[PDB]
Ligand binder design. Structure first.
Ligand SMILES: O[C@@H]1[C@H](O)[C@H](O)CO[C@H]1O
Length: 271
């Protein structure tokens, strides 16, 4: 059994657990051995993970960068060891990558901003909780969101990173609420931060604020159905992991693949 390795940015996020299960289920199906390594949002740890795999008989490296610019060293190391690299969910700015599989994050941010304008109205006062700064996902969602801003003349009271983390998303929202109690809507770049923000508005008695997340995880989807979360942009993590293993199979077979494989997004609301 050829071994395929999956280096995921973190496992302390439901989105990445689903991504891992999708890859795992497809690996079982195609008869591969899947090794899963966790970088814990640490580029130094990612590098150590990749260096350890290049001598384990790893045939293909599926990688979710902790940082789109910093991952280039790990990619170049996989290149040196003649191990083809496929990026999942986030890009590698440089380094030789056979294929990239991800959602259209620029579209995702605009759609998020457009839904806010539809509910909170044009010229609405918003706060944006951003993801991990150096990743392509956060960067692109912000750009897409900046398009809805200009178009809907939104007044952005504040925009700040909460690192795709639920607890950080809670503390950052907590701190911003004290300074900006007039907030009407919040765009949270993932469901974890969106759920943290919700808890902050809860602790503050500020139930009037409209929160839009991203991912459509089990928790994110439930909060929308319970009426707490206004909407989330559903991604298909399991299919990104599966498509990644599927593509790793073709490369090993000698079949050429596309340099990019998009995955569908879907606005999620109650009913
Ligand atoms: O797309 C992924 C998911 O949104 C995850 O929740 C955080 O990292 C992003 O890159």
């Amino acid at each position: 059994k050829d071994t395929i390795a999956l280096v995921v940015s973190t496992l302390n996020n439901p989105f990445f657990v689903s991504l891992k299960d999708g890859a795992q289920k497809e690996a079982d199906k195609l008869g591969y051995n899947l090794v899963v390594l966790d970088s814990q949002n640490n580029p130094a740890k990612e590098l150590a993970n990749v260096q350890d795999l290049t001598v384990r008989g790893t045939k293909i490296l599926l990688i979710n960068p902790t940082d789109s610019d910093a991952v280039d060293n790990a990619v170049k190391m996989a290149n040196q060891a003649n191990i083809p690299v496929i990026t999942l969910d986030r890009q590698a700015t440089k380094g030789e990558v056979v294929s990239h599989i991800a959602s259209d994050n620029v579209l995702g941010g605009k759609i998020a901003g457009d839904y806010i304008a539809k509910k909170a109205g044009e010229g609405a006062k918003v706060i944006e909780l951003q993801g991990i700064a150096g990743t392509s996902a956060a960067r692109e969602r912000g750009e897409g969101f900046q398009q809805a801003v200009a178009a809907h003349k939104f007044n952005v009271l504040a925009s700040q990173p909460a690192d795709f983390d639920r607890i950080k998303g809670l503390n950052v929202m907590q701190n911003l609420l004290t300074a900006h109690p007039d907030v009407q809507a919040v765009f949270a770049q993932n469901d974890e931060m969106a759920l943290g923000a919700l808890r902050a508005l809860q602790t503050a008695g500020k139930s009037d604020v409209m929160v839009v997340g991203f991912d459509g995880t089990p928790d994110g989807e439930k909060a929308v159905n319970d009426g707490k979360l206004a909407a989330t942009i559903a991604q298909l993590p399991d299919q990104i992991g599966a498509k990644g293993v599927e593509t790793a199979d073709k490369v090993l077979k000698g079949e050429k693949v596309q340099a990019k494989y998009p995955v569908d997004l879907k606005l999620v609301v109650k009913q």
